[PDB]
Amino acid sequence: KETAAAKFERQHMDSSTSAASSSNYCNQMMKSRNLTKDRCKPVNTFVHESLADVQAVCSQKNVACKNGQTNCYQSYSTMSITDCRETGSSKYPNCAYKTTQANKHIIVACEGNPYVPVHFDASV
Amino acid sequence: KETAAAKFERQHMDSSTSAASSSNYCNQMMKSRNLTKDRCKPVNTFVHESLADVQAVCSQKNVACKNGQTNCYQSYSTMSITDCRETGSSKYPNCAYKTTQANKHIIVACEGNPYVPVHFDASV
């Protein structure tokens, strides 16, 4: 099995680009990050900052997660992100996504030692 | 009981201001909208656009909701919003919130006839 930290990296980290390069970014990334195997993951956000900057969020603003848990953190600064969401033309195994680029604060849940992101909660 | 549409209005609509007026906006609004009765609602977003403009989102971009349901819609345009999230100093019945103002697309789930928003899913 994948560690929670490694799963967050696979699902949510893209430090190789400063932003989504095309409208096809999500189609390409949801597939290559293995989020279209066995099902179309409906919603997923990629963060275009260094892994260091995203891990650093775990020592930034402590906020409640949507589910009421207390181990969520909001980035002090805004970050380049891409939201990927399934569109009406999407049907497994032909998954289809809308790519929306934005600059927002990210909110992540953190766990472990080292204390690192394990869930992407929301962006603001 | 409250209708789903009326609950969305109470939880998510603030057409009376163009944006959050102070850092205390969420403390005031979470209380006056009855979201601190019986418990501190952990996370909640207010939309500073007309009710008409928010209802109109139900005929805009059809996208998957985070939970996989197919009745979510993303606003074509960005809207003035405020995210309210519980802080570490928060403890029922003294609920405490961080106010974060932003301009983003909203994603809402829609139901019924008339087809209107009944859940705030996310903003992008």
Side-chain angles (χ1 to χ4, degrees):
Chain A
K1 194 171 186 175
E2 208 172 18
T3 67
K7 179 179 183 176
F8 176 97
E9 294 166 346
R10 180 178 55 87
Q11 294 194 120
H12 299 301
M13 288 306 306
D14 183 13
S15 311
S16 78
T17 57
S18 62
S21 30
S22 72
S23 63
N24 212 58
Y25 173 85
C26 288
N27 289 326
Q28 298 162 188
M29 291 290 293
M30 295 299 286
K31 175 175 162 186
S32 67
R33 295 304 183 92
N34 298 329
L35 300 179
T36 60
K37 197 165 158 192
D38 307 315
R39 56 207 201 161
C40 299
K41 192 182 178 186
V43 176
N44 188 70
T45 301
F46 285 100
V47 184
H48 307 277
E49 302 293 345
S50 69
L51 178 61
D53 279 3
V54 171
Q55 289 172 328
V57 177
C58 297
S59 69
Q60 298 176 20
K61 193 65 183 195
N62 185 216
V63 299
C65 314
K66 277 182 187 175
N67 72 2
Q69 295 185 279
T70 66
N71 64 317
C72 275
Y73 296 84
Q74 181 165 326
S75 65
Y76 287 145
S77 194
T78 63
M79 294 186 169
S80 174
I81 65 173
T82 302
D83 189 49
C84 298
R85 285 200 179 233
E86 264 197 293
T87 65
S89 66
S90 189
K91 193 182 181 192
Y92 183 70
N94 310 94
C95 301
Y97 293 89
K98 177 179 164 54
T99 297
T100 305
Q101 174 64 32
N103 284 280
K104 278 117 48 157
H105 303 89
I106 66 168
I107 299 172
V108 297
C110 301
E111 279 176 43
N113 186 349
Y115 197 54
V116 294
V118 295
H119 290 303
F120 191 95
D121 202 49
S123 66
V124 175
Chain B
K1 194 171 186 175
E2 208 172 18
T3 67
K7 179 179 183 176
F8 176 97
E9 294 166 346
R10 180 178 55 87
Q11 294 194 120
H12 299 301
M13 288 306 306
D14 183 13
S15 311
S16 78
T17 57
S18 62
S21 30
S22 72
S23 63
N24 212 58
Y25 173 85
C26 288
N27 289 326
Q28 298 162 188
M29 291 290 293
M30 295 299 286
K31 175 175 162 186
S32 67
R33 295 304 183 92
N34 298 329
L35 300 179
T36 60
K37 197 165 158 192
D38 307 315
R39 56 207 201 161
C40 299
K41 192 182 178 186
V43 176
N44 188 70
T45 301
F46 285 100
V47 184
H48 307 277
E49 302 293 345
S50 69
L51 178 61
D53 279 3
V54 171
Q55 289 172 328
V57 177
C58 297
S59 69
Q60 298 176 20
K61 193 65 183 195
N62 185 216
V63 299
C65 314
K66 277 182 187 175
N67 72 2
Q69 295 185 279
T70 66
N71 64 317
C72 275
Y73 296 84
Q74 181 165 326
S75 65
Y76 287 145
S77 194
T78 63
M79 294 186 169
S80 174
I81 65 173
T82 302
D83 189 49
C84 298
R85 285 200 179 233
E86 264 197 293
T87 65
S89 66
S90 189
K91 193 182 181 192
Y92 183 70
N94 310 94
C95 301
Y97 293 89
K98 177 179 164 54
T99 297
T100 305
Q101 174 64 32
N103 284 280
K104 278 117 48 157
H105 303 89
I106 66 168
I107 299 172
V108 297
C110 301
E111 279 176 43
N113 186 349
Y115 197 54
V116 294
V118 295
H119 290 303
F120 191 95
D121 202 49
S123 66
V124 175

